[PDB]
């Protein structure tokens, strides 16, 4: 079909194509952020929000893909094809999962309006040619880059 | 007829020449930004804005220019002239379209007054000597302060 | 994308396919009608109407295409390919511009309802086989074909 | 100085450029019509209307042009060049004066709005290919379509 | 006659004498800034403000100076003396016109009080020895110190 | 740009083309008139009038030209080139500067409408053929 898992939330696959391919953190770092900020709500028995539902589903499917990787590394004798499949699962399927994770963790941490405005502004930034581009790329944050809160 | 594509919007061809010619993103990146942000409005059977009207027209005209370039590639046998024509369509007309798409997408995203003050300020900045101007190049951003 | 520059106004590319390919006036005649009826409004600094916006954009792009034609006629040494490109720009791209011009000038002069009704009626006329087709094709006009207004 | 003699009245040299060369009566017939419809007003010491002012001026410059033609015919001994200049004066300048006289006589007879809509509709008719238009040009006249003066 | 072109506006040739020679954009950049910020007001038939009057006059005298430079380059056969005069016109008189254009464009952009306090503070900064002053000259700009145009 | 320095003051360059090139007094005479009539107001720190602003600007741009001329006469060793360029500075730019000074001093002294009617009347006088042209050329005066 044509689900396009972001258009339900307000972004699209092409709106997230503003961000380059290597912009997204690693799958380990994104799973660490998830378990560090929303573990007790991702394990609760209630529909907390659509982001929580989609994030639970994403994590279960990555778990199914990591079980696949373990199984193939255990069961395939041909090492060339074995490492081929494992590297494919880890990188080429991993990129789609990291784009999915980044989006959900960031839209939970900062908000839909903030994440969409950040996507637009980072599109502007990465579009602007290098010679006329400021060094301060836009970034998501809840505090100013320097925070003078003495006590 | 001596028509400005920007005079009704409050800009001018010389006001968009006030920025470096290589400041504007590629036509590919700008068409991607348009289809990523306002596709459902650039395909609806409503006007919704002079910017949507002008942006629909601009994209149709670029599609016609790209069909021209494909036709040239297929139907010109002389490679020198063929690649000269294609390079012209991609660089001169491509620069004019990138200046046009940038203006309309940026206006729709940020605001007419915001984009005009940005044009003026970035033009003044790129001309101020380096030691007496803020060090970071100006940029447009929807992300507020925290 | 799928802009279809008429569906914003109420027609479509297929509704304007009722009219044959050679029905549309020349680009020179349509630019003359434009500069004879709406020049002071096409050069004004205000959004007069969506037809005016689209017509300004169309005229600027035809100007860009005529600058292309001048450039190629000046810069291409190979005469065969030069005249090939110039004839292409003038006829095959010209037809699309004349369909665009005719539509906008007529919808400004006569009105959207009148232009759409004319498209439907000319579809009926040009569809009817020649033997059962009246000689009076439908035409757009603000006066009767004969106008007895003595003084 | 690039002056349009109709722009003052609402027409345009590009709006009257559609009426074919054979559309206008001869200079003699248009002068007879002027002197038989508005002689007592084109010979009065009163500012009657802009059409009267322009008609007076046009007739004076045609008188000067006819004096020119007579002088050429009398004083150019070369018959070839003499007939060349006479033909030029009687056809090119003659057509311009026929277009100018027709416009003013017809404005005075019918009305500004009437003659302008007539020019518009005749442009629409003369731009259509001969195969898609009613075969009888639109007519501007004071007579009924039956041409029977009752009462 | 010992006229101060800024004393009328509140500055003084001795108040602008502190801004170094490298502080001002080139004549070309300052003319581009003028013609891109206030062209429709520097070309209007209206007395807009003393800054507009002085800007019009300054630009006319620079036009005369550029005509002089072109005439020198064309008509002085001696290359040494020709380049000598051209260098003089482009550097000395050029610096005076850069100082004059900067002052008027900056007044029109920012304000009399703002540009005067800026000149005062820049004088304080440029008079201090390099060892007792903050290393970054004071800046007059419309951009935020972050140079990110939001809203 | 097409700034046209007289447009704001109500004239145009083609209106001042009514007066010939050899009609305007020397720049010396015009500067003498200025320093005799409006020195205390051109040296004042006040926007007295747009004519005062334009006249201050013109006087400063002429002072810069004269400094250029002196600098050239001192520093250019080639006498031919030096005399050529100083003669250019004195005549070809002095012409436009005495046009500007004439316009502004005359407007200040007599009035905008008076100077404009003078320009129109001088157009009439210089267009009239010589056989029907009075020997008394038009002249500006408040007497």
Author numbering:
A (entry chain D), C (entry chain D), D (entry chain B), E (entry chain B): 1 to 151
B (entry chain C): 1 to 146
F (entry chain A): 1 to 143
What does the paper say about this structure?
The inner shell is an icosahedral capsid formed by 240 copies of hepatitis B core protein (HBc). The N-terminal domain of HBc is mainly α-helical and assembles into dimers, which form protruding spikes at the capsid surface. Peptides based on the hexapeptide “LLGRMK” block the interaction between capsids and L-HBs and inhibit virion formation. These peptides bind to the tips of the spikes where envelope and capsid are in touch but are distant from the hydrophobic pocket.
Structures of the low-secretion variants HBc-P5T and HBc-L60V have not been reported previously and were determined for the first time in this study. Both variants formed icosahedral capsids with protruding spikes and adjacent holes. The overall resolutions were 3.2 Å with B-factors of 139 Å² (P5T-HBc) and 158 Å² (L60V-HBc), respectively. The maps of P5T-HBc and L60V-HBc were almost indistinguishable from WT maps (local cross-correlation > 0.9) except at regions close to the mutated residues (local correlation < 0.9). Here, L60V-HBc showed somewhat larger differences, which affected the spikes surrounding the 5-fold symmetry axes (AB spikes) more than those surrounding the 3-fold symmetry axes (CD spikes). Next, we built models into the maps of L60V-HBc and P5T-HBc. These models had the same backbone conformation as WT-HBc confirmed by RMSD values between the Cα atoms of less than 1 Å (RMSDP5T = 0.5 Å, RMSDL60V = 0.7 Å). While in WT-HBc and P5T-HBc, the phenylalanine side-chain of F97 pointed towards the dimer axis, in L60V-HBc, it had an additional alternate position pointing away from the dimer axis. Based on the density observed in the EM-map, almost 50% of all F97 side chains must have adopted this alternate conformation. The alternate orientation of F97 in L60V-HBc increases the adjacent hydrophobic pocket similar to the smaller side-chain in F97L-HBc does, which also points away from the dimer axis. However, local cross-correlation maps and DSC indicate that the mutations P5T and L60V impact differently on the capsid properties: While the mutation P5T weakens the stability of the whole capsids (lowest TM), but leaves the spikes unchanged (high local correlation), L60V stabilizes the capsid slightly (largest TM) and changes the spike around the pocket (lower local correlation).
